[PDB]
Amino acid sequence: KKARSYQIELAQPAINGKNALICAPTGSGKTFVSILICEHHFQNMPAGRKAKVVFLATKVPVYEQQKNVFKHHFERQGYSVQGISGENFSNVSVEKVIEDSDIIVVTPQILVNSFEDGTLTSLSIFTLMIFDECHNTTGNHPYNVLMTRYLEQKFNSASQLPQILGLTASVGVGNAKNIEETIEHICSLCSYLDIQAISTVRENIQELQRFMNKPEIDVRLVKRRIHNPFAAIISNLMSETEALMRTIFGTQNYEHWIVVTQRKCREEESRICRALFICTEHLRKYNDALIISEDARIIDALSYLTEFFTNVKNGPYTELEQHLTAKFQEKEPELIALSKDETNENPKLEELVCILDDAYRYNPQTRTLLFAKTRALVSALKKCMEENPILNYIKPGVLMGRGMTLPSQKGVLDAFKTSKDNRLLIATSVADEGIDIVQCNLVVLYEYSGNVTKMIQVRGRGRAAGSKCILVTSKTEVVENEKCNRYKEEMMNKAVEKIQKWDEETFAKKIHNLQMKERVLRD
RNA sequence: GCAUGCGACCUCUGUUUGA
RNA sequence: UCAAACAGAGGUCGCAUGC
Ligand SMILES: Nc1ncnc2c1ncn2[C@@H]1O[C@H](COP(=O)(O)OP(=O)(O)O)[C@@H](O)[C@H]1O
Ligand SMILES: [Mg+2]
DSSP: OOOOHHHHHHHHHHHTTOOEEEEOOTTSOHHHHHHHHHHHHHTTOOSSOOOOEEEEESSHHHHHHHHHHHHHHHTTTTOOEEEEOTTTGGGSOHHHHHHHOSEEEEOHHHHHHHHHTSSOOOGGGOSEEEEETGGGOOTTSHHHHHHHHHHHHHHHHOSOOOEEEEEESOOOOTTOSSHHHHHHHHHHHHHHTTOSEEEOOOTTHHHHHHHOOOOOOBOOBOOOOSOOHHHHHHHHHHHHHHHHHHTOOOSHHHHHHHHHHHHHTOOOSHHHHHHHHHHHHHHHHHHHHHHHHHHSOHHHHHHHHHHHHTHHHHSOOOHHHHHHHHHHHHSHHHHHHHHTOSSSSOHHHHHHHHHHHHHHHHOTTOOEEEEOSSHHHHHHHHHHHHTOTTTTTSOEEEEOOOOOOHHHHHHHHHHHHHOSSSOEEEEOGGGGSSOOOTTOOEEEEESOOOOTTHHHHTGGGOOSSOOEEEEEBOOHHHHHHHHHHHHHHHHHHHHHHHHTTSOHHHHHHHHHHHHGGGOOOOO
């Protein structure tokens, strides 16, 4: 692992002391650049005043990952590298850990936290800050909260602040519909993080196209399976429950409307009150059951329901709770017969099955990441893997936050990198940024939509020459929005390539002009 | 529990072209 | 008045993540 020539090139503007943003493609080794910057920070430190470096990483696993690189590289040099975090925060006084540490890796919230906490009131304490996936500097996200602070202190003392460093493979594109606006948005981002130079692989492009490369995002539309009995059955069982509401579908809006009706109603009042807290719930859990089958199997939907109708007995189980539960159990053996179906299943799941086989026969040692939007879905997908004879080649893992333990995470990832047991990892948003599975080959998106940023960062989870990235939708708009992104992403690059062709003064001037939009008076 | 990003939804007030 | 488009201010909700 010898410094690459573009890596040393990207370094330059930061070593000349300037607040840099390092835009360089997903996987190019920006993290190395930042440690290289870090050596040339300690090296060059003037006087007796010495250096504290803080690396900030957005989500926990990325904090862990980067914390561990940084230790393995600087501890042997004889540096104190300590990681404060969500686990560590109410076990340590930040005060000390900084003054003990030459390098602190941090979840960004912690510094925010400890700033309101009193523990800390001077960003001056560090001499270099690094923001991994720095593009997250928006509105009231921690990064900006801290950076607002940084900017205030700039005027309120003009007495040395730390050097800033943004790493990002995805500078973004605001709402910019035109290249001119995309530039206004990028320049906006540079202002938030007080950038004075943007770093690009300018001169060493050829070297860069070697090491990391990217392809298309194979989009796959599957039409909703014609003849869907299950959808009709529940909708009617909901219609009869909506008919009964006056006497006293599978969309987001139905959930929104159920909460409209649950707040309005919150002893001819009191018996009608908790009558609608019985009507709304059943309608809601029917609704959730539709939308759970939308992606999963019917067997997951009916699971979700028996899990509710056996729970209707537990609590009150009043008159109405009996007349509704019974309406279901008449029409239940109809459904459990449909569970047992062969052909009539979600064709999104038929395609994934196809897709995973297509890749695990052609290459038996592939490592996939299957991304889904929601925990429930991610977890329900693990069931869909295990229980399918054609796909249980591979043990599947799951990655998450917590409603999964932070140690339980360390395990599944550490496993998935090198196990050759579980060669596929279903994950959620935690995994979509900054995370480095060297042996990862394929990344599959299961109704994983999104911003340009997401759909750049996610396909970049696929490393190691072997790269492929396959989406699976049934929706029109999702097939399009994503195409839309492939334009926005092209536009994004030019924005920068262009911005880069300005002179020092005029870029600098742009950022100040933008910052001056955010000052504060003193009297 | 709280925060944030993101998405859906709705409202107000204005500008555009249309009928 | 209607429809369609853009933008400024606000209300609610869902997901994910962070503390
Ligand atoms: N000069 C180098 N030579 C060989 N491997 C490198 C070099 N620099 C970085 N890498 C490796 O590239 C992989 C991904 O790097 P990373 O910096 O996380 O990508 P990103 O820039 O998207 O964050 C890591 O395994 C890292 O060790
Ligand atoms: Mg990185």
